[PDB]
Design an enzyme around this catalytic site. Structure first.
Site, PDB file in Angstrom:
ATOM      1  N   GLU A  77      -3.917  33.140 -13.004  1.00  0.00           N
ATOM      2  CA  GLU A  77      -3.771  32.360 -11.799  1.00  0.00           C
ATOM      3  C   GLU A  77      -2.354  32.591 -11.303  1.00  0.00           C
ATOM      4  O   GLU A  77      -2.108  33.482 -10.494  1.00  0.00           O
ATOM      5  CB  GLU A  77      -4.044  30.863 -12.057  1.00  0.00           C
ATOM      6  N   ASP A 135      -2.786  30.780 -21.637  1.00  0.00           N
ATOM      7  CA  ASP A 135      -1.621  30.170 -20.996  1.00  0.00           C
ATOM      8  C   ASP A 135      -0.343  30.136 -21.807  1.00  0.00           C
ATOM      9  O   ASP A 135       0.565  29.355 -21.470  1.00  0.00           O
ATOM     10  CB  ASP A 135      -1.953  28.755 -20.473  1.00  0.00           C
ATOM     11  N   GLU A 183       4.428  31.585 -13.075  1.00  0.00           N
ATOM     12  CA  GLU A 183       4.569  31.099 -14.441  1.00  0.00           C
ATOM     13  C   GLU A 183       4.613  32.263 -15.479  1.00  0.00           C
ATOM     14  O   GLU A 183       5.178  32.125 -16.566  1.00  0.00           O
ATOM     15  CB  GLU A 183       3.592  29.950 -14.739  1.00  0.00           C
TER      16      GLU A 183
HETATM   17  O1  LIG Z   1      -2.371  17.964  -7.580  1.00  0.00           O
HETATM   18  C1  LIG Z   1      -3.810  17.861  -7.711  1.00  0.00           C
HETATM   19  C2  LIG Z   1      -4.224  18.006  -9.174  1.00  0.00           C
HETATM   20  O2  LIG Z   1      -3.180  18.736  -9.860  1.00  0.00           O
HETATM   21  C3  LIG Z   1      -3.199  18.849 -11.304  1.00  0.00           C
HETATM   22  O3  LIG Z   1      -2.027  19.499 -11.864  1.00  0.00           O
HETATM   23  C4  LIG Z   1      -1.990  20.934 -11.636  1.00  0.00           C
HETATM   24  C5  LIG Z   1      -2.509  21.770 -12.814  1.00  0.00           C
HETATM   25  O4  LIG Z   1      -3.920  21.685 -12.828  1.00  0.00           O
HETATM   26  C6  LIG Z   1      -2.173  23.260 -12.701  1.00  0.00           C
HETATM   27  O5  LIG Z   1      -2.671  23.962 -13.864  1.00  0.00           O
HETATM   28  C7  LIG Z   1      -2.473  25.394 -13.835  1.00  0.00           C
HETATM   29  C8  LIG Z   1      -3.643  25.867 -14.676  1.00  0.00           C
HETATM   30  O6  LIG Z   1      -4.763  26.082 -13.852  1.00  0.00           O
HETATM   31  C9  LIG Z   1      -3.491  27.154 -15.465  1.00  0.00           C
HETATM   32  O7  LIG Z   1      -4.333  26.972 -16.610  1.00  0.00           O
HETATM   33  C10 LIG Z   1      -5.551  27.693 -16.519  1.00  0.00           C
HETATM   34  C11 LIG Z   1      -6.686  26.740 -16.799  1.00  0.00           C
HETATM   35  O8  LIG Z   1      -6.758  25.759 -15.769  1.00  0.00           O
HETATM   36  C12 LIG Z   1      -8.005  27.481 -16.940  1.00  0.00           C
HETATM   37  O9  LIG Z   1      -8.883  26.616 -17.624  1.00  0.00           O
HETATM   38  C13 LIG Z   1     -10.095  26.509 -16.941  1.00  0.00           C
HETATM   39  C14 LIG Z   1     -10.336  25.044 -16.608  1.00  0.00           C
HETATM   40  O10 LIG Z   1      -9.285  24.498 -15.767  1.00  0.00           O
HETATM   41  C15 LIG Z   1     -11.650  25.033 -15.859  1.00  0.00           C
HETATM   42  O11 LIG Z   1     -11.802  23.722 -15.266  1.00  0.00           O
HETATM   43  O12 LIG Z   1     -12.688  25.451 -16.787  1.00  0.00           O
HETATM   44  C16 LIG Z   1     -12.557  26.818 -17.231  1.00  0.00           C
HETATM   45  C17 LIG Z   1     -13.717  27.224 -18.157  1.00  0.00           C
HETATM   46  O13 LIG Z   1     -13.346  28.324 -19.010  1.00  0.00           O
HETATM   47  C18 LIG Z   1     -11.168  27.054 -17.857  1.00  0.00           C
HETATM   48  O14 LIG Z   1     -10.875  28.460 -18.048  1.00  0.00           O
HETATM   49  O15 LIG Z   1      -7.892  28.606 -17.811  1.00  0.00           O
HETATM   50  C19 LIG Z   1      -6.810  29.493 -17.613  1.00  0.00           C
HETATM   51  C20 LIG Z   1      -6.870  30.482 -18.744  1.00  0.00           C
HETATM   52  O16 LIG Z   1      -8.088  31.211 -18.612  1.00  0.00           O
HETATM   53  C21 LIG Z   1      -5.502  28.743 -17.597  1.00  0.00           C
HETATM   54  O17 LIG Z   1      -4.416  29.606 -17.251  1.00  0.00           O
HETATM   55  O18 LIG Z   1      -2.155  27.466 -15.854  1.00  0.00           O
HETATM   56  C22 LIG Z   1      -1.191  26.389 -15.850  1.00  0.00           C
HETATM   57  C23 LIG Z   1      -1.335  25.332 -16.972  1.00  0.00           C
HETATM   58  O19 LIG Z   1      -1.932  25.859 -18.175  1.00  0.00           O
HETATM   59  C24 LIG Z   1      -1.110  25.774 -14.448  1.00  0.00           C
HETATM   60  O20 LIG Z   1      -0.373  26.715 -13.639  1.00  0.00           O
HETATM   61  O21 LIG Z   1      -0.775  23.434 -12.508  1.00  0.00           O
HETATM   62  C25 LIG Z   1      -0.369  22.841 -11.286  1.00  0.00           C
HETATM   63  C26 LIG Z   1       1.092  23.150 -11.052  1.00  0.00           C
HETATM   64  O22 LIG Z   1       1.827  22.315 -11.942  1.00  0.00           O
HETATM   65  C27 LIG Z   1      -0.542  21.341 -11.409  1.00  0.00           C
HETATM   66  O23 LIG Z   1       0.014  20.734 -10.254  1.00  0.00           O
HETATM   67  C28 LIG Z   1      -3.328  17.437 -11.874  1.00  0.00           C
HETATM   68  O24 LIG Z   1      -3.396  17.444 -13.286  1.00  0.00           O
HETATM   69  C29 LIG Z   1      -4.590  16.772 -11.319  1.00  0.00           C
HETATM   70  O25 LIG Z   1      -4.849  15.491 -11.948  1.00  0.00           O
HETATM   71  C30 LIG Z   1      -4.458  16.644  -9.807  1.00  0.00           C
HETATM   72  O26 LIG Z   1      -5.717  16.138  -9.376  1.00  0.00           O
END
Ligand SMILES: OC[C@H]1O[C@@H](O[C@@H]2[C@@H](O)[C@H](O[C@@H]3[C@@H](O)[C@H](O[C@@H]4[C@@H](O)[C@H](O[C@@H]5[C@@H](O)[C@H](O)O[C@H](CO)[C@H]5O)O[C@H](CO)[C@H]4O)O[C@H](CO)[C@H]3O)O[C@H](CO)[C@H]2O)[C@H](O)[C@@H](O)[C@@H]1O
Ligand SMILES: OC[C@H]1O[C@@H](O[C@@H]2[C@@H](O)[C@H](O[C@@H]3[C@@H](O)[C@H](O[C@@H]4[C@@H](O)[C@H](O)O[C@H](CO)[C@H]4O)O[C@H](CO)[C@H]3O)O[C@H](CO)[C@H]2O)[C@H](O)[C@@H](O)[C@@H]1O
Ligand SMILES: OC[C@H]1O[C@@H](O[C@@H]2[C@@H](O)[C@H](O[C@@H]3[C@@H](O)[C@H](O)O[C@H](CO)[C@H]3O)O[C@H](CO)[C@H]2O)[C@H](O)[C@@H](O)[C@@H]1O
Length: 710
Positions: free
Chosen positions: A542, A464, A546
């Site tokens: 994803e 990320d 971004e």
């Molecule tokens: O509104 C309801 C809920 O919203 C949340 O906020 C949102 C936020 O989650 C979102 O994040 C985006 C990310 O998905 C993305 O990051 C990626 C990671 O999520 C992912 O990691 C995963 C992990 O999430 C999973 O559960 O386990 C996996 C095991 O390996 C792990 O890989 O990995 C990706 C890399 O491989 C990574 O890109 O990117 C951004 C942040 O890093 C986000 O775009 O963004 C939304 C838009 O802002 C948010 O709204 C709240 O936090 C919750 O509390 C609410 O319930």
């Protein structure tokens, strides 16, 4: 023209950031060579162990796995997926119009190169060299290192090349080998056409290119075994249809070993990039499979298109190109800079806008930008940065208010400073093992971390960086463009280090790995970094917007500094980004790269090398899935990346049917997207719906009121 692969800077990040050595080390990297291991590359799984040796490496159209343990001896495993499995989740009202939920590639052993000497042993492994487009993977017998196979693994390769050194070829399959034509006449020669009993029928051709011919014996339904150790190159290729046999024969002697990428800007508002394929020899034509977007942008004047196709893992059919060089052109660069193209809103909206912009500036910036983590914090800063930007370009926006413009800039600076200064809740560290910067949060306790690798979204393990750092770069460039003298040195150093972490174009900048998040063959970025356990499906991404946000920032930093190569570089990447987005991620009607019923989904969901999943990392709700592809809305996303043709199609298939029901800030996201195609209707709704934590109401209305058909 103008060369784009230059350093941004050569400033030593040790002067800004505390120094660390990343705790999680590659396992199989040749220490002795002085190349940096990539953290987000399609080669990356090669440097690490994985659950049951199942993690894949996908040059495409071949999937590879190493030392997976099925139908016998361990070796290099090939899967070439003609077809794919689809699957859904139990249907919901949270996901209203959907039967097809994911596309996967079955883990099957079409064929495997190995040797007899490895019946009673597991080979040692080492990645001996690599570059952006290839890695060399050696398998040797333990404490007999002179007994090895080298596998030059190259993006797009049409065969798998094995250089056997004093080791007895063994080929095997999960499938029955139902026939063996040797030299088109126990079996002997330099050519071997084998046929499987799988469906569709797989045909491979094995070629031995060493001194001697091969002699092979059927040892079982799926083992051909050489008669004595071989030294020299073997190649195996899938025969895509009967009519391409001469084609594979003629090019058998020539194999890719790597490749050089350059890139230039063309005076008439275009840019290009060249892959110079490296090969063992020019004694026959180089056959190289290309992705869809390659076909639509390559300069034909030097390749030959064939009709020889194979499916890739997750990008649609690949088409083989004959030729040593590929020059890919993007002739229509973005003209977007700071503002929307129509810079000044519909005037009857100005009072409303100013009113709103005054409520928004009164916000508490510390409390809205000093969040638990860097990601949401960065979201907050970029949002106010937008407000400071439109007030202070009132020349164009016609939003004059000197006193509020000054406040909007000062409050931003005060918010942004703790970040500049690296005193935010989750500060960075310069990493000397993988040559980039990492957030502290997910590091071990012994380094101040939370000991939790999943912290700050994987950023400590190199997930990320383009997402997170894109926000800080846009904020930095906006500040620097409005106040070129405020903390100018520290600001340059820091902002350029963040840029460099993600997108260093030149490895004579030896403080940072080159193109950490960018893949010149796929034409897009990867989000997913290091995965201790193995990335069972390879890289993932994803959010497209971004990624777009980062290169936008980078372009803005170019404009802010007068850095031409940087400005063009960032533009080329936004073009290629646009082209891959529509080929593989945001599906217009007419998309050949996916089944009909995944195209109907309109967005791919979470994109991986080996699968697609229609869902998010954070909840299976329609508006999350589509929403993440719609923020941050910026002039880049609005004017250039998200076309009216796509917004309209997505609106009519899925989203216009759920948007008026959505009560979360996901409404705000959705209707700001809708403004792209109907700002008359979007405007009233954005007057009242909720804003995503990175959206403001003033900017939402100003953007909407700038759609020239309002
Ligand atoms: O509104 C309801 C809920 O919203 C949340 O906020 C949102 C936020 O989650 C979102 O994040 C985006 C990310 O998905 C993305 O990051 C990626 C990671 O999520 C992912 O990691 C995963 C992990 O999430 C999973 O559960 O386990 C996996 C095991 O390996 C792990 O890989 O990995 C990706 C890399 O491989 C990574 O890109 O990117 C951004 C942040 O890093 C986000 O775009 O963004 C939304 C838009 O802002 C948010 O709204 C709240 O936090 C919750 O509390 C609410 O319930
Ligand atoms: O809301 C309650 C709790 O839910 C959590 O949010 C979940 C989220 O975790 C889920 O993410 C999944 C990933 O779990 C999954 O990752 C896979 C790996 O676990 C596996 O080992 O490897 C493969 C690749 O080889 C990965 O696929 O991948 C899918 C995508 O395929 C992700 O969507 O998704 C849920 C629905 O969107 C979401 O609700 C949250 O993290 C908890 O803390 C929370 O309390
Ligand atoms: O978002 C929907 C749903 O997703 C769930 O994640 C699963 C993954 O568990 C799965 O990962 C596969 C492994 O289970 C398997 O053994 O190996 C393969 C590689 O060969 C992995 O891809 O992928 C599926 C389909 O994409 C996902 O549904 C989450 O657990 C769950 O919380 C979430 O609701």
């Amino acid at each position: 023209g103008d060369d784009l692969f230059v350093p941004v800077s050569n400033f030593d990040p040790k002067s800004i950031f505390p120094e660390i050595k990343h705790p999680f080390e590659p396992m199989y990297a040749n220490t002795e060579n002085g190349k940096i291991v990539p953290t987000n590359s399609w080669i990356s799984n090669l440097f690490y162990p994985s659950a049951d040796n199942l993690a894949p490496t996908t040059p495409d159209p071949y999937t590879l796995r190493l030392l997976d343990g099925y139908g016998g001896n361990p070796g290099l495993t090939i899967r070439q997926p003609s077809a794919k499995v689809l699957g859904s989740y139990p249907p919901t009202n949270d996901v209203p119009y959907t039967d097809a939920g994911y596309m996967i590639n079955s883990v099957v052993v079409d064929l495997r190169l190995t040797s007899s000497e490895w019946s009673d042993v597991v080979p040692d492994r080492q990645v001996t060299d690599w570059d952006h487009l290839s890695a060399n993977l050696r398998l040797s017998t333990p404490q007999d290192s002179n007994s090895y196979i080298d596998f030059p693994i190259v993006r797009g390769m049409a065969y798998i090349t094995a250089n056997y050194n004093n080791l007895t070829p063994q080929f095997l399959s999960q499938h029955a080998i139902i026939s063996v034509e040797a030299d088109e006449k126990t079996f002997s020669g330099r050519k071997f056409k084998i046929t499987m009993n799988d469906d569709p029928t797989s045909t491979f051709i094995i070629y031995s290119l060493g001194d001697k011919p091969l002699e092979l014996r059927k040892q079982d339904n799926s083992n051909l075994v050489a008669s004595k150790p071989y030294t020299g190159v073997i190649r195996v290729a899938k025969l895509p249809a009967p009519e391409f046999e001469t084609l594979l024969d003629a090019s058998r002697a020539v194999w890719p070993t790597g490749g050089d990428i350059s890139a230039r800007s063309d005076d008439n508002n275009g840019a290009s990039y060249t892959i110079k394929w490296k090969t063992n020899s020019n004694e026959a034509p180089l056959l190289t499979y290309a992705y869809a977007h390659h076909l639509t942008s390559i300069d034909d004047s030097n390749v030959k298109r064939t009709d020889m196709t194979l499916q890739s893992a997750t990008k649609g059919p690949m088409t083989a190109l004959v030729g040593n060089e590929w020059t890919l052109r993007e002739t229509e660069l973005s003209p977007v800079e700071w503002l929307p193209l129509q810079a000044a809103p519909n005037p009857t909206t100005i009072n409303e806008i100013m009113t709103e912009i005054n409520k928004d500036i009164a916000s508490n910036y510390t409390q809205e930008t000093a969040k638990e983590d860097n990601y949401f914090s960065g979201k907050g800063l970029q949002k106010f940065a937008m407000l400071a930007l439109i007030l202070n370009k009132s020349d164009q926006t016609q939003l004059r208010n000197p006193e509020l413009a000054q406040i909007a800039l000062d409050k931003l600076k005060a918010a942004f400073l703790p970040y500049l200064q690296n005193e935010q809740a989750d500060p960075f560290r310069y990493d000397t093992l993988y040559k980039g910067i990492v957030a502290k949060a997910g590091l071990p306790t012994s380094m101040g971390g939370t000991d939790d690798l999943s912290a700050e979204f994987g950023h400590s393990y190199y997930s990320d960086h383009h997402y997170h750092q894109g926000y800080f770069v846009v904020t930095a460039a906006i500040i620097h463009h409005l106040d070129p003298t405020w903390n100018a040195d520290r600001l340059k150093a820091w902002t350029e280090a963040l840029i460099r972490d993600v997108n260093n174009a030149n490895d004579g900048d030896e403080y940072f790995a080159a193109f950490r998040n960018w893949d010149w063959f796929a034409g897009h970025s990867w989000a997913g970094g290091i995965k201790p356990d193995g990335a069972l499906d390879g890289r993932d991404q994803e959010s497209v917007p971004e990624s777009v946000n980062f290169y936008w920032g980078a372009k803005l930093w170019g404009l802010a500094t007068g850095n031409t190569p940087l400005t063009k570089l960032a533009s080329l990447q936004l073009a290629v980004t646009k082209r891959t987005t529509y080929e593989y991620f945001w599906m217009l009607d007419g998309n050949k790269n996916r089944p009909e019923n995944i195209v109907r989904n309109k967005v791919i969901g979470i994109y991986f090398e080996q699968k697609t999943d229609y869902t998010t990392y954070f909840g299976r709700f329609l508006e999350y899935i589509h929403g993440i592809q719609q923020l941050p809305m910026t002039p880049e996303l609005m004017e250039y990346i998200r076309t009216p043709e796509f917004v309209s199609q997505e609106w009519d298939e899925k989203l216009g049917a759920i948007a008026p029901t959505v009560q979360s800030p996901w409404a705000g996201v959705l209707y700001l997207n809708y403004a792209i195609i109907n700002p008359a209707e979007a405007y009233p709704a954005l007057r009242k719906v909720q804003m995503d934590d990175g959206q403001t109401r003033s900017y939402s209305l100003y953007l909407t009121a700038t759609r020239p058909h309002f």
